[PDB]
Nucleic acid binder design. Sequence first.
DNA 1: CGCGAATTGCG
DNA 2: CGCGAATTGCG
Length: 134
Amino acid sequence: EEIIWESLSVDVGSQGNPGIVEYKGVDTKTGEVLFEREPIPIGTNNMGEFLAIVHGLRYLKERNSRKPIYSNSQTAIKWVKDKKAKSTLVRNEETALIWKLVDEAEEWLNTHTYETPILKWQTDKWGEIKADYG
DNA sequence: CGCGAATTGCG
DNA sequence: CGCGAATTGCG
Ligand SMILES: [Mg+2]
């Protein structure tokens, strides 16, 4: 399998797991930032990766783009394809925002179709995903 | 740490 | 014993 350069890559920037979560999606070739989510005060890295993929799906659907999405998170890819985020994060006032976003992303998946291929970024083969925060 | 996949007590 | 609940590599 080879890299599809005409694609979108997503990744999460964490400050702890659980901890603050942000994410972005970038053009795999150029690095152009296409969308970003401001820091969510608490969530898990997995929840962030899930939100990042779904955000990418919504972005690409709006623009009628057929570009694939790359994610380095096998867990998030599975959650998106299952249309179910199997997170164990406690639901309380502290985590209300991340769970609101996750619940809404699930609702979107369960009420829409999409053509975007969702592909695993192979870090061991290809180096850093283009959306990496460092 | 959180995940999926795997391995490990009370009916 | 079964069936699951809970425990035990990778990022
Ligand atoms: Mg990541």
